[PDB]
Design an enzyme around this catalytic site. Structure first.
Site, mmCIF file in Angstrom:
data_model
loop_
_atom_site.group_PDB
_atom_site.id
_atom_site.type_symbol
_atom_site.label_atom_id
_atom_site.label_comp_id
_atom_site.label_asym_id
_atom_site.label_seq_id
_atom_site.Cartn_x
_atom_site.Cartn_y
_atom_site.Cartn_z
ATOM 1 N N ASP A 299 0.852 -1.178 -0.007
ATOM 2 C CA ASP A 299 0.243 -0.046 0.355
ATOM 3 C C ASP A 299 1.046 1.012 0.412
ATOM 4 O O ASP A 299 0.283 2.254 -0.273
ATOM 5 C CB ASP A 299 -1.107 0.178 1.761
ATOM 6 C CG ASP A 299 -0.290 0.061 2.490
ATOM 7 O OD1 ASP A 299 0.483 -0.605 2.441
ATOM 8 O OD2 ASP A 299 -0.921 -0.097 3.513
ATOM 9 N N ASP B 226 6.658 0.972 3.654
ATOM 10 C CA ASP B 226 6.630 0.242 2.734
ATOM 11 C C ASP B 226 7.511 0.853 1.669
ATOM 12 O O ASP B 226 8.366 -0.213 0.750
ATOM 13 C CB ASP B 226 5.304 0.083 1.601
ATOM 14 C CG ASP B 226 4.021 0.146 2.363
ATOM 15 O OD1 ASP B 226 3.282 0.723 3.652
ATOM 16 O OD2 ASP B 226 3.271 -1.067 2.056
ATOM 17 N N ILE C 182 3.058 -6.460 1.979
ATOM 18 C CA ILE C 182 2.902 -4.960 3.495
ATOM 19 C C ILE C 182 1.578 -4.509 3.585
ATOM 20 O O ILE C 182 1.535 -3.385 4.017
ATOM 21 C CB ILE C 182 4.704 -4.562 2.777
ATOM 22 C CG1 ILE C 182 4.687 -4.350 1.715
ATOM 23 C CG2 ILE C 182 5.375 -5.953 3.461
ATOM 24 C CD1 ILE C 182 5.646 -3.594 1.842
ATOM 25 N N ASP D 126 7.324 -2.968 8.153
ATOM 26 C CA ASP D 126 7.531 -3.314 6.959
ATOM 27 C C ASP D 126 8.657 -3.627 5.958
ATOM 28 O O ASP D 126 8.311 -4.994 5.621
ATOM 29 C CB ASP D 126 6.461 -2.286 5.597
ATOM 30 C CG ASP D 126 5.285 -2.321 5.960
ATOM 31 O OD1 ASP D 126 4.198 -2.824 7.115
ATOM 32 O OD2 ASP D 126 4.511 -1.726 5.301
HETATM 33 CA CA LIG Z 1 2.601 -1.005 4.569
#
Ligand SMILES: [Ca+2]
Ligand SMILES: [Ca+2]
Ligand SMILES: [Ca+2]
Ligand SMILES: [Ca+2]
Lengths: 322, 322, 321, 321
Positions: D9, D14, D129, D250
């Site tokens: 996302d 991330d 993730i 993540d």
């Molecule tokens: Ca994430």
């Protein structure tokens, strides 16, 4: 003045009679069929639909295979049944038309992808669902714009007075019970007009219809289609008769409503509805606001005599639909 | 040939009219009243019932205070309302009969204990509930033999086609919504005959009754009881009329059904039922097996004209109940 | 002295816990209340009364309470013959022999007794070692009861969602037996609450099994030692068949009530509630870890002190320290 | 080399995790797939594409997937502006500047891409993730997909019911964002599954905060260091205001995919499912502790190795060891 249809089906006894009605009715133009799991496996549904096309002396209509399982695939939701036979249509694979190994294969493309592509290009078509709603829900998950693509959605399923028809521990109707999440997704997120043919339409007038209509008379003409529909419905008819009633129409009414809604839907009501997912006894039940709900049209009484007249026309070859 | 009654009530506008009907009807013998939380607090319910006894020129009938909260006391279940006034009966404490500080006290013994003791000794009595079922459920938790003690239980509450009357996010009826656990306990574990007067009995015939009955005419006689019932119903009447309908009878029908079930219950049906507890939208809904359920009698249509005739007799002092 | 009322379902570990309380010189038992649980409420009552005799005590009232959970849903049921059909070894003719009057209580329902007794004894601790049904019924009758005990010590629940009933559930046993009751008690009691969760037993099970002989206190050949040998017999045989000792459980909650500072070596204070509606999580405690009154969870207990107290109880040595 | 597909996302952590994967010489990235989560799927896509440029890489396909969770229930929603409205610091004009084409994907839906890519690359690891929606849609379309990845490494879930969304829930964030998807994936994938649960972060938070400078790798003044400084800026300021460092999350799942034996110091293997129906426990993992394929949970990870790898990534030193 033809109505363009896509029919999504689990391909058991009433489905195949409904599909035969659509294949014979001169007002109907069938773009495609899509198979879904339900009372039988999706592979068997596919096979039954393809066999039914041949029985109707038609060809060159694509049948796409769709979802093998419900969205969640929870065991408590399972509605697979041998009630109509192991194969859903009387367990006589050698009778006309003989089952062929290629019947269990679809066109190639998953049904949900086919629904997107076909209805994007044919925005004037009606989508009719006569099994669980899994294929339609997967289309929405892939493409939120699909919410607008059908001209109209006619659903065989659900209820409006919480009358269930699966078993005594659920208030859900069969097709909704088979994939409650899918029903939730479709009712909440479709943006076209929806017409639902609920279980109560069948339940409350069943004793009256059983007294006034001979539901087997259209089977007796001795045409290939009559003989095929006799076979397809054979096990359902014997089991109903052993309990003192006729095997009556169900899915046929949804297809008929798609073809001429004003003729077949004698009474109807608009209600604001949503689907319960979490209840122990009420999972799959439609909940109505009688005081995230969406306004939907329910057919509350249907013209069984017109549907019967159309099935006689289909099986006899008379062509007398007026 | 008298019917012995115990009435359990949350003591708002229709409750007090219902209780007045029972106090004036020559066939009724009232053993006790028990107060329960509901649309108002249990203390206020107690006070309203005691005030109503005085308005009816009666005395020496015990009123026991019961449960202040539902079994779980979950906030989402709450049904307290100022719809009929803060005090549930028109917010005029100085009018006849004037509220007294002792009105907010009960006899001493908790209602649930009183229900056990009274019905153990009076096995021919009918228990009528016109609020949430909390007191009755607590009695069962204390004494499983209580399941057999009433001769009959007449419940104002529930539904049979999932028509709710609280708000658009629930399919529960009001008294059931107020304590779903209690309704579950009572329907599953009582062993006497149960007659339920469901919401649908009121809902489906409301427009018809509104055209054919003047629900205010019995209020106009100028007797003390007419004047008291005018006050008690005042805020309900103004709010209904502002929305283009009459404030109509509700709880009165359950008490009338207790007094002469064969007269008041024009149509009825027996159904096998249980109560949903876990659903997001269907908590408190009755679930029916239409295919741990218990068989219960539902009144599906009532004789509103006879109830109206009895209320005129009560308020006018005519004594004309035949 | 610590004044106690103990509410129990009267099986093997309950009976040993109650014996600990009857022998410990710091404890003063006001009353026992019986609740359904692993056995019926009638059997629980009978077991508690029998246990009072085995401890050479008399004139302590035992009140019979709830026969069923609040809802009485069949999926919650926790009745078991794991410790015997009678919950304590199935030998009714051994000392003290079972009498027909054992199955009767003092008269008034346990929930009414809890209200009365604790209204008058606001310095008492209530200890629960079965399902919470009686306590919840008391609250339904009398919301003021929320303030009556000086402290509530609960054997039950969990704080990391470790269940001990079966693979279908994340609930602990006593809470599984009446989830609605646990919800009512944890939300609506206003006194200090100490919970002895399942994780306190689970995580240190194998360490304890290596360092403590959980049978040694049974060896003295006093009447109490022989009675507790009988009461625990079927449990011990079934645990040993699976390579484990039958270890203390309810005893720890009673010990904690007697001397919380000694027995509770480590504790956490958490905001909690009880899930009622989940398919797999009904009865589970749900903790707010992203930070109503915090509840104290005992996360590690002093098993050696409890063991020393049980030796003193069965031997008659007086050595509680 | 380890072949990876990463489904994300596209927010602050991330982007740092993806940068780690792009710089690590053992990793070979086949494709990225974007999913809704903390930001919209369109923004996730854009962030991933921007991150590829900041890492001096090109010609890696990014496919746009699910815009909504399966059900799209409003109570599940996890969209947040905590890391900025765009999820990475709200400075679209800084290098690499945001382009309008960033918001478009390669063309085919991510779920269809996952099927195709992993059918042909059965030796690849899938790393998730964000919410699990894309993976679940793939399974709905193709049950055979259950066997396609060689391994699935999931950032999400929990094993002691420790939630990180709010006090109303025992669910972890990614699972909260699509509970039905998590249920489908954990029940219906047949490859080995490694989960990096919230507890691995929660329990060691304060220890790590004392021993690791989570900002030091940002100090090098290379283009990647400056981009990750921007991407993490709003997170860092908000954490520091509350007395804490913005720590890795993540990144640990991506590191685990690259070298699971190095990064996963302690693990437990558990039978699990996901609760869907509870009021407070929807999205919670439910574990069977009273003993389908066991899933591996990483219970403790090597934060120092991950930190060393991030220094190598941003500095350009090559020192991954
Ligand atoms: Ca994430
Ligand atoms: Ca069908
Ligand atoms: Ca009332
Ligand atoms: Ca116990």
């Amino acid at each position: 003045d033809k109505v363009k249809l896509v029919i999504d089906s689990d391909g058991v006894s009433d489905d195949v009679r409904a599909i035969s009605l659509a294949l014979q009715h001169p007002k109907a133009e069938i773009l495609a069929f899509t198979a879904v799991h339900g009372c039988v496996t999706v592979d068997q549904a596919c096979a039954n639909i393809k066999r039914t096309i041949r029985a109707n002396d038609r060809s060159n209509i694509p049948v796409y295979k769709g979802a093998a399982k419900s969205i969640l695939s929870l065991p408590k939701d399972d509605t697979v049944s041998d009630f109509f036979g192991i194969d859903g249509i009387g367990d006589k694979p050698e009778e006309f038309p003989k089952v062929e190994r290629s019947d269990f294969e679809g066109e190639g493309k998953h049904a949900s992808l086919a629904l997107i592509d076909i209805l994007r290009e044919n925005r004037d078509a009606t989508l009719v669902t006569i099994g669980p709603l899994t294929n339609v829900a997967i289309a929405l998950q892939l493409c939120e714009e699909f919410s607008t693509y059908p001209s109209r959605l006619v659903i065989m399923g659900g209820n409006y007075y919480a009358v269930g028809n699966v078993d005594g521990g659920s208030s859900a109707e069969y097709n909704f019970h088979g994939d409650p999440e899918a029903a939730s997704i479709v009712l909440r997120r479709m943006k076209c007009p929806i017409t639902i043919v609920p279980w109560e339409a069948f339940y409350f007038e069943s004793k009256t219809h059983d007294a006034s209509v001979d539901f087997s008379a259209h089977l007796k003409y001795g045409t290939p289609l009559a003989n095929y529909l006799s076979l397809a419905t054979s096990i359902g008819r014997v089991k109903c008769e052993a309990n003192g009633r006729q095997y009556s129409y169900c899915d046929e009414i949804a297809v008929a409503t798609a073809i001429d809604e004003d003729k077949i839907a004698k009474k109807s009501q608009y209600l604001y509805v949503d689907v319960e997912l979490n209840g122990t006894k009420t999972r799959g039940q439609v909940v109505v606001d009688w005081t995230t709900h969406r306004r939907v049209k329910f057919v509350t009484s249907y013209d069984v005599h017109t549907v019967d007249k159309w099935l006689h026309a289909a099986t006899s070859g008379s062509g007398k639909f007026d």
